[PDB]
Amino acid sequence: QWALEDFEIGRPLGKGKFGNVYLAREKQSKFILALKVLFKAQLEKAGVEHQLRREVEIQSHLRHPNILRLYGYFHDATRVYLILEYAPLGTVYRELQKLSKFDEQRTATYITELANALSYCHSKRVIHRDIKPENLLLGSAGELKIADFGWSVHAPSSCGTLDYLPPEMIEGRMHDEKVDLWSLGVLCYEFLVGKPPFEANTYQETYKRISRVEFTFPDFVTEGARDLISRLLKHNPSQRPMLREVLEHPWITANSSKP
Ligand SMILES: Nc1ncnc2c1ncn2[C@@H]1O[C@H](COP(=O)(O)OP(=O)(O)OP(=O)(O)O)[C@@H](O)[C@H]1O
Numbered sequence: 001q002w003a004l005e006d007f008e009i010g011r012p013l014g015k016g017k018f019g020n021v022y023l024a025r026e027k028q029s030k031f032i033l034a035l036k037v038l039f040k041a042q043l044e045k046a047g048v049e050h051q052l053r054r055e056v057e058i059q060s061h062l063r064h065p066n067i068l069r070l071y072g073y074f075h076d077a078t079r080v081y082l083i084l085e086y087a088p089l090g091t092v093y094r095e096l097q098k099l100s101k102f103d104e105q106r107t108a109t110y111i112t113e114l115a116n117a118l119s120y121c122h123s124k125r126v127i128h129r130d131i132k133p134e135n136l137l138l139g140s141a142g143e144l145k146i147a148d149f150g151w152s153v154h155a156p157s158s159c160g161t162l163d164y165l166p167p168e169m170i171e172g173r174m175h176d177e178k179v180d181l182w183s184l185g186v187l188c189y190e191f192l193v194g195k196p197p198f199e200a201n202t203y204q205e206t207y208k209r210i211s212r213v214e215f216t217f218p219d220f221v222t223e224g225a226r227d228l229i230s231r232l233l234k235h236n237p238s239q240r241p242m243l244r245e246v247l248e249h250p251w252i253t254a255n256s257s258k259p
């Protein structure tokens with residue numbers, strides 16, 4: 001109930017792992033959307049339909065102002081197309097490259113929007129597992145929008161850089177919704193410092209650093225922030241807080257700018 005000839009394709013938006021996202025317009029409605037294209041050949045040669053069908057199921061059923069809408073799907077000869085909500089202000093990844101690092105206000109606000117969207121996901125027993133600045137998009141009012149549900153799955157459960165992954169995931173162990181709170185602390189740190197707390201020149205060093213929880217705050221990180229990052233970056237996934245605790249944290253409530 002969809003076809004490529006219903007869309008007027010435009011400019012590339014970003015590059016994915018299995019194909020590019022293009023700015024596009026539905027001819028009949030003049031609707032602006034993003035078309036994520038994936039090549040059947042590459043997903044095959046990797047064996048990830050798997051997730052692609054999981055991404056589509058999970059994403060089409062989520063309705064939240066801080067989660068990216070998936071309007072549909074369709075396919076052809078060698079391509080698989082996803083019709084997504086277009087995020088006009090790009091990624092949190094590009095904004096951090098421009099600004100180098102974010103102020104406590106911008107960070108707390110993004111951490112608030114993340115927690116909201118995450119509560120919603122966890123309330124449907126859905127774990128994102130791929131929370132990275134390359135997957136955090138910005139809508140026309142600068143609001144965060146969680147995207148890329150390729151690696152998401154239902155809680156509990158058992159490719160790229162290891163930076164945002166909790167020790168239980170890197171160690172192949174069993175994992176639940178607490179995985180998304182480790183990511184939230186890695187993001188909070190990265191937003192303030194400009195780099196993730198466990199970055200290394202090798203996948204190998206990063207693994208040691210994550211498993212040991214080897215992180216140090218530079219001087220400009222306030223006690224308020226130090227507290228929450230240390231609270232979320234706990235090796236024991238039971239020792240991590242709930243999103244309700246995050247949303248109510250003094251540093252969060254004090255610096256977050258509510259709507
Ligand atoms: N709706 C959108 N609006 C604007 N830019 C987008 C949109 N969707 C994706 N992008 C850009 O395109 C790139 C690819 O996005 P995405 O993460 O969905 O692909 P991917 O990483 O291949 O997903 P997966 O993790 O399932 O492989 C991102 O860097 C993002 O900046």
Ligand SMILES: O=C(O)c1cc(-c2cccc(Br)c2)nc2c(F)cccc12
Binds near residue numbers: 039040052056073
């Ligand atoms: O064997 C195929 O034709 C094939 C189909 C699809 C597909 C169909 C409907 C919805 C979605 Br999401 C995907 N995907 C493929 C793929 F990812 C790789 C190789 C073949 C297919």
